[PDB]
Design a protein around this ligand. Structure first.
Ligand SMILES: CC(=O)Nc1nnc(S(N)(=O)=O)s1
Ligand SMILES: CC(=O)Nc1nnc(S(N)(=O)=O)s1
Ligand SMILES: [Ca+2]
Ligand SMILES: [Ca+2]
Ligand SMILES: [Ca+2]
Ligand SMILES: [Ca+2]
Ligand SMILES: [Ca+2]
Ligand SMILES: [Ca+2]
Ligand SMILES: [Ca+2]
Ligand SMILES: [Ca+2]
Ligand SMILES: [Ca+2]
Ligand SMILES: [Ca+2]
Ligand SMILES: [Ca+2]
Ligand SMILES: [Ca+2]
Ligand SMILES: [Zn+2]
Ligand SMILES: [Zn+2]
Lengths: 222, 222
């Protein structure tokens, strides 16, 4: 029963169940307004994707694309396998107080279940050809899933310039578990106004959790 | 009833009460082994201390020196007021897998109760003149407090080289609350073997929480 709106909305998540306690007491929650940044000597993130997107699901909260095993990123010398990617509108993260109209999340898990999420901002621009393939088949109602005709390579949704912001955060939907590595790409991608409109219409409203305080954290920039 | 040893010891803290839940589920706990470090362009920490130490307490877990109001540090543009300093042996933080024999913590709180702690490592060496003043009057039993004859300036216990490690962490004793700014000084201070021995004898054993995983975190170095 958690939602983006009303009485079961984000400000009340932590009161819905005991398992959602982090949504209430957590001090390292996501998303954030990226507005306390320091230059840091970070390593490039190794992105080892192959074409693997198989299905597209509407879960009522987002449009989620499942990925078959074998694609991974490397962070802190550890392999995190790509499980799925999904979308939010407007952007969950903000950048110096401003939203983008759309944000993609690429969700990865190491062998022990530790999570790393790559966030990619999308601005209004030219029609995105990869998103067109998914949008063409996007399920309208919650609980519906469709198989993709051809396997999409998620790497095509990532910018070529791979500078990034990094911080220690959380999942952005309940249970809002902490210990999550956030990698937010500096360079924005593009999609059409129409593509953005379609996603919003299907979702039926905004799909972003409000930004959460940074508290003791800094954001590191590569 | 939490302790450093036995059945109420650090591995069991999280099971002692509901209020100690972070000690069990927290993914941003302190202390840590400082072993995933990145150079960062951090600003110097402004340290505006005056002579203000008034009393020395043995609370059974540490020797704690209270400070009168008016001394503060600046972090992220915010003023955090020095409340107290206290000690652990051996060090709580490790540095590339190794302990120092002793560590001091300088505990600060901003106007909203957000905490910032400065950690200072001590190595065995020449006798520390400032610590000698406190040690001379150190209460030997839990619950005993003594007033200092003369006010001490905590700044004299900080290194002159002010490079530091920074990360987002927790209090190191229950309730192990998160959202704490840790500033660990890169340069070690010095104290005599005798001084270390005396503190240890009075405490009756080790006073350090075991290091906790870094999880998604990096340590930034100035
Ligand atoms: C099962 C799973 O992955 N759950 C997620 N919940 N929130 C996520 S997000 N917005 O942080 O990427 S992923
Ligand atoms: C009253 C107060 O400051 N409590 C503290 N508990 N643990 C601390 S530590 N080892 O993280 O400095 S300070
Ligand atoms: Ca710069
Ligand atoms: Ca750049
Ligand atoms: Ca920049
Ligand atoms: Ca660029
Ligand atoms: Ca740009
Ligand atoms: Ca672009
Ligand atoms: Ca270096
Ligand atoms: Ca030095
Ligand atoms: Ca240095
Ligand atoms: Ca040194
Ligand atoms: Ca020294
Ligand atoms: Ca160094
Ligand atoms: Zn998401
Ligand atoms: Zn301490």
């Amino acid at each position: 029963g958690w939602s983006y709106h009303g009485e079961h909305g984000p400000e009340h998540w932590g009161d819905l169940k005991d398992e959602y306690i982090m949504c209430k007491i957590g001090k390292n929650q996501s998303p954030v307004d990226i507005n306390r940044i320091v230059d840091a000597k970070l390593k490039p993130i190794k992105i080892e994707y192959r074409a693997g997107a198989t299905k597209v699901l509407n879960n009522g909260h987002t449009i989620k694309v499942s990925y078959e095993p074998g694609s991974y990123i490397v962070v802190d010398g550890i392999k995190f396998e790509l499980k799925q990617f999904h979308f939010h509108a407007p952007s969950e993260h903000k950048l110096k107080g401003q939203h983008y109209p759309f944000e993609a999340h690429f969700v990865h898990a190491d062998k022990h279940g530790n999570l790393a999420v790559i966030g990619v901002f999308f601005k209004e621009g030219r029609e995105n050809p990869i998103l067109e393939k998914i949008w063409k088949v996007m399920p309208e109602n919650a609980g519906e899933e469709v198989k993709l005709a051809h396997k999409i390579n998620a790497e095509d949704l990532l910018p070529k310039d791979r500078d990034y912001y990094r911080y220690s955060g959380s999942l952005t939907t309940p249970p809002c578990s902490e210990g999550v590595r956030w990698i937010v790409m500096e360079e924005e991608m593009e999609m059409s106004k129409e593509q953005i409109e379609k996603f919003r219409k299907i979702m039926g409203g905004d799909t972003n959790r409000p930004v959460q305080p940074l508290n003791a954290r800094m954001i590191m920039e590569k």
